[PDB]
Write a protein that binds this DNA or RNA. Structure first.
Ligand SMILES: [Mn+2]
Ligand SMILES: [Mn+2]
Lengths: 161, 612
DNA sequence: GACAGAT
C-alpha cells in the first residue's frame, strides 16, 4: 500500500479524485505518474478531476489563489475585439479564458501578455497556475509568469465552430 | 520629285502640337471637309528624301460595332440569337463627321503613314481603323519599303517628340484584335441580357413600363458594390464596448486627457475591475517620453481617378460633371489632357516654367515666389503608364476669367501641382505614457516644425494642438478623475462616389474615361440614388437585381470576371492564343449562362413580387 | 423604340 501517485500529485498539482486516478491508469502494474499525466492530458478534466477551487470563486470575498493547480480551458474570447472582426488589430489582444476543474468554474483575464495562449488554442488545453495568483472582481489575472500551457488533445466541437 | 507623308493623331490638339514641334514652325493650317479636324502642312525630311508632311487628326474612335439589319429590332429576334447567329459590322461613330471619306480624300497620293495615335490598347485599334480606310487609297509600294509607321510617345515636349520621330516602329495587330474581341463580347453579352430583362420585366410588372433594365460587364459589378455595402449596413448588430479614460491636471491650469493603451473592452465586469483598481488613486507617474520627428509626404502627380475622387469628396461634383468641366478647361487651354492614368512627370517636362506662370495670382503668389527663389523639390516617382502626362495647369486663370464651377476645379489642379513640387510637412509627435496604478495610459500630441505643401493645400494639414508639458521619467502628476465611458460600434455608411472609384479602379472595372459614365448610367436606370455626402443608396430595383443574380449565377456580379476575361483576352495581344478561338469559347461560356438565367429567372421574380 | 463599353 504505497500510493506514491497521490503522493506525487499532492506535491506537483493535478488534483484528481480516486475515480479519476483509477480511470487514468492504463495498466494495473504499478504507479506510472508520467503516463497518468499523459492520459490526463489526453482526457477531459470535467469527468476525472476532483474539486480544488474554493466555492464562490466567481464572486468577491476571495483575493488570492494559492498553490500550483491544473485547470482546463473551455472557451477563449478576445474581449478587445468585436464578435464580428475577432482578429481586429485596432486594440491590443486581451483574452477572457473560461477555465474550470471537474466541478467549479472560473474566469481569467490576460493581463500583461501571453504568446503561448492564442485565439486558436484548442478547448481542453490545460494550464498550470503557479504561485499566488491575484483574483480581482472574480477574475484571475493571468500573465506569462504564472501560467504554464501544458497542452492537451480532447475532442473538438470547435472544429464545427 | 517629292513625296507626301500623312500623319494621323487621335485629337486635333495633339495634331497641332506635334505639327508645331516637328516643323520648327512653318506649318500652314487649313480645315478639312468635316468642320472639326484641320490639316497642317509643312516640308521636311523622311527616309533620306525631302517630303511634304500632312498632319491630320481623328476624333476618338472612327468606328463602333453594331448588329446588322433585322437584329437591331427589339421584337424580331430572340436575344439568345445575339451570340452566334447575329452578324456584326463596324459602322461609323459620329456619322456627322464623315471621317472615313475625310481620311480617304486626304490620303490620295500619300506615300507614307506615320500613326501618331495614343500609345494605349485602344490606340492600336484606332490605328487599324485608320489603316483599313487609308491603305487602299495610297500609292503602290515599290521593293518592300515600310510605308506604315507608328510613333511611340507620351510627352508632348520638343525633345520627346523629336525622339519619337527618330524612333519609329510598326503597329501591333494583336492588340487591335484583342480590343475587337472585347468589343464583340461586350456588345453581344450586354445586348442579349438587357433585351431579355427589359422584355421580361415590362410585360409582367406595370411599374417598370418604359424602364430600361440593363446588364453589363461593368454596370452590374458597379451596382453590386453598392448592394454589398447595403447588405453590410442591414446585417449589422451594434455591440457595446467600454473605454476607460482619465484626466491629469498638471500646473493647475491644464487637463490632459489620457488615452487607454488597451483601447477598448467588450466586457462590463472587466471594465468594472479596471476602473475599480484605478479610481481610488491620486498620483499618476510618468514612464516614457517620445519626441520623434515625422514627415507627411507630398502628393503624387494628379490623374483622372484622383481628380474625380477629390471632386466628389471636397468640391462636391459628380464624376460626369467633373469630367465635363475638365474637358471644357482642356479645350479652352487651361489644363492638360484630363483623362490620364499617369502619376509620373516626364523627365523633360518643364516644371519650373509652368510654375512660373502662377506667380501673379494673389492666393499663392508668395509660395510660388519662395519656391522659385530657394529652389524647387524633385517630384515623387509614380506610375508611368505611357498614355498621357498627368493633369497640370498650363495657363494663368482668375475667378473672373473662369466660371463659378470651372474655377474650383482649376484651383484644385493648380494647388495640387504646386504641392507636388513643394517640400514635405515635418512635424513632431510627442508621446507621454502614464502609470495610474496597475494600468497604463498615453497622451499623444503633434506640433508642426515646418509646413511644406500644406500652405498650398491647407485642408491636408496637421491640426493645431497645444504642446504637451515637458516631463521626464519619474515625474509625478496629480490625477483629477478617471471615468468609464459606454460606447457602441457604429454601422457603416453607404458607398460614396470617391470610395466606388477606388473599388472600380482596384478591380479593373471601367477605364479612365468610362468610370464617370458607369456611375452615371446606374443612376439614370434608377439603380442607385445619390444622397447627402455623395453617397450612393441602392434602390429597390438595384437590390432585387444583384440579389437575384447571386441566386441564379454569381459569375455575373463579382468584380473578378472582368479581370478574368481581360486576362484571357490578353493572350491574344501576346500572341499565345488565336483570336477566333478565344472569342468563340468565351461567347459559348456566356451563352450557357444566359440559358441558365432564362430558365431560372424565377429567382428574381420571387424578389420582384414583394416590391412592385 | 431602346442595348454593351469606350473614346
Ligand atoms: Mn485615347
Ligand atoms: Mn486609359
Amino acid at each position: 500500500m504505497a500510493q506514491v501517485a497521490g503522493a506525487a500529485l499532492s506535491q506537483a498539482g493535478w488534483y484528481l479524485s480516486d475515480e479519476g486516478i483509477e480511470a487514468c491508469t492504463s495498466s494495473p502494474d504499478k504507479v506510472n505518474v508520467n503516463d497518468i499525466i499523459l492520459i490526463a492530458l489526453n482526457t477531459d478534466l470535467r469527468t476525472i478531476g476532483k474539486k480544488f477551487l474554493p466555492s464562490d470563486i466567481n464572486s468577491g470575498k476571495v483575493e488570492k489563489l494559492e498553490g500550483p493547480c491544473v485547470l482546463q480551458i473551455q472557451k477563449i474570447r478576445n474581449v478587445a475585439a468585436p464578435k464580428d472582426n475577432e482578429e481586429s488589430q485596432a486594440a491590443p489582444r486581451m483574452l477572457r479564458l473560461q477555465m474550470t476543474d471537474g466541478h467549479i468554474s472560473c474566469t481569467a483575464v490576460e493581463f500583461s501578455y501571453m504568446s503561448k495562449i492564442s485565439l486558436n488554442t484548442p478547448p481542453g488545453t490545460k494550464v498550470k497556475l503557479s504561485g499566488i495568483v491575484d483574483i480581482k472582481n472574480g477574475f484571475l489575472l493571468l500573465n506569462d509568469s504564472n501560467t504554464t500551457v501544458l497542452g492537451g488533445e480532447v475532442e473538438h466541437l470547435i472544429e464545427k465552430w | 520629285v517629292m513625296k507626301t507623308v500623312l500623319m494621323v493623331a487621335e485629337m486635333p490638339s495633339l495634331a497641332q502640337s506635334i505639327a508645331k514641334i516637328l516643323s520648327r514652325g512653318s506649318l500652314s493650317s487649313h480645315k478639312g471637309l468635316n468642320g472639326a479636324c484641320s490639316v497642317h502642312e509643312y516640308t521636311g525630311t523622311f527616309a533620306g528624301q525631302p517630303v511634304r508632311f500632312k498632319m491630320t487628326s481623328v476624333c476618338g474612335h472612327v468606328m463602333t460595332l453594331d448588329f446588322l439589319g433585322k437584329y437591331n429590332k427589339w421584337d424580331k429576334v430572340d436575344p439568345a440569337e445575339l451570340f452566334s447567329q447575329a452578324p456584326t459590322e463596324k459602322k461609323e461613330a459620329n456619322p456627322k463627321l464623315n471621317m472615313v471619306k475625310f481620311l480617304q480624300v486626304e490620303g490620295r497620293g500619300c506615300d507614307y503613314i506615320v500613326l501618331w495615335l495614343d500609345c494605349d490598347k485602344e490606340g492600336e485599334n484606332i490605328c487599324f481603323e485608320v489603316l483599313d480606310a487609308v491603305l487602299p487609297v495610297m500609292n503602290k509600294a515599290h521593293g518592300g519599303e515600310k510605308t506604315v509607321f507608328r510613333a511611340r510617345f507620351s510627352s508632348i515636349t520638343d525633345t520627346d517628340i523629336c525622339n519619337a520621330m527618330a524612333c519609329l516602329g510598326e503597329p501591333d495587330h494583336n492588340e487591335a484584335l484583342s480590343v475587337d474581341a472585347r468589343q464583340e463580347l461586350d456588345l453581344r453579352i450586354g445586348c442579349a441580357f438587357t433585351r431579355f430583362q427589359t422584355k421580361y420585366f415590362q410585360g409582367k410588372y406595370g411599374d417598370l413600363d418604359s424602364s430600361l433594365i440593363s446588364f453589363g460587364p461593368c454596370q452590374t459589378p458597379t451596382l453590386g458594390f453598392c448592394v454589398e455595402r447595403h447588405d453590410k449596413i442591414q446585417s449589422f448588430k451594434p455591440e457595446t464596448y467600454w473605454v476607460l479614460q482619465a484626466k491629469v491636471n498638471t500646473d493647475k491650469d491644464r487637463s490632459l486627457l489620457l488615452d487607454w493603451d488597451r483601447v477598448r473592452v467588450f466586457d462590463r465586469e472587466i471594465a468594472q475591475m479596471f476602473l475599480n483598481m484605478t479610481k481610488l488613486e491620486k498620483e499618476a507617474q510618468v514612464e516614457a517620453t517620445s519626441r520623434k520627428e515625422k514627415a507627411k509626404q507630398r502628393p503624387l502627380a494628379l490623374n483622372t481617378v484622383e481628380m474625380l475622387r477629390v471632386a466628389s469628396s471636397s468640391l462636391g461634383m459628380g464624376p460626369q460633371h467633373a469630367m465635363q468641366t475638365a474637358e471644357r478647361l482642356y479645350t479652352q487651354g487651361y489644363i492638360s489632357y484630363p483623362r490620364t492614368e499617369t502619376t509620373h512627370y516626364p523627365e523633360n517636362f518643364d516644371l519650373k516654367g509652368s510654375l512660373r506662370q502662377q506667380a501673379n495670382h494673389p492666393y499663392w503668389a508668395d509660395t510660388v515666389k519662395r519656391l522659385l527663389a530657394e529652389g524647387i523639390n524633385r517630384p515623387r516617382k509614380g506610375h508611368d503608364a505611357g498614355d498621357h502626362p498627368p493633369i497640370t495647369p498650363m495657363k494663368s486663370a482668375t475667378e473672373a476669367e473662369l466660371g463659378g464651377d470651372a474655377w474650383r476645379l482649376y484651383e484644385y489642379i493648380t494647388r495640387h501641382f504646386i504641392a507636388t513640387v513643394s517640400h514635405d510637412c515635418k512635424y513632431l509627435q510627442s508621446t507621454i505614457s502614464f502609470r495610474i496604478g496597475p494600468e497604463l495610459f498615453t497622451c499623444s500630441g503633434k506640433t508642426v516644425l515646418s509646413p511644406g505643401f500644406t500652405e498650398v493645400m491647407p485642408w491636408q494639414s496637421v491640426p493645431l494642438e497645444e504642446s504637451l508639458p515637458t516631463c521626464q521619467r519619474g515625474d509625478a502628476f496629480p490625477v483629477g478623475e478617471v471615468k468609464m465611458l459606454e460606447k457602441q460600434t457604429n454601422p457603416p455608411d453607404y458607398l460614396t462616389e470617391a470610395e466606388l472609384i477606388t473599388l472600380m479602379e482596384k478591380h479593373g472595372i471601367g477605364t479612365d474615361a468610362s468610370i464617370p459614365v458607369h456611375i452615371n448610367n446606374i443612376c439614370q436606370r434608377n439603380y442607385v440614388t445619390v444622397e447627402s455626402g455623395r453617397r450612393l443608396k441602392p434602390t429597390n430595383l438595384g437590390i432585387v437585381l444583384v440579389h437575384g443574380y447571386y441566386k441564379i449565377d454569381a459569375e455575373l456580379v463579382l468584380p473578378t470576371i472582368r479581370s478574368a476575361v481581360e486576362k484571357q483576352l490578353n493572350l491574344i495581344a501576346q500572341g499565345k492564343a488565336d483570336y477566333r478561338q478565344v472569342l468563340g469559347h468565351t461567347l459559348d461560356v456566356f451563352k450557357r449562362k444566359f440559358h441558365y438565367f432564362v430558365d431560372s429567372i424565377a429567382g428574381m421574380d420571387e424578389l420582384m413580387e414583394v416590391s412592385f
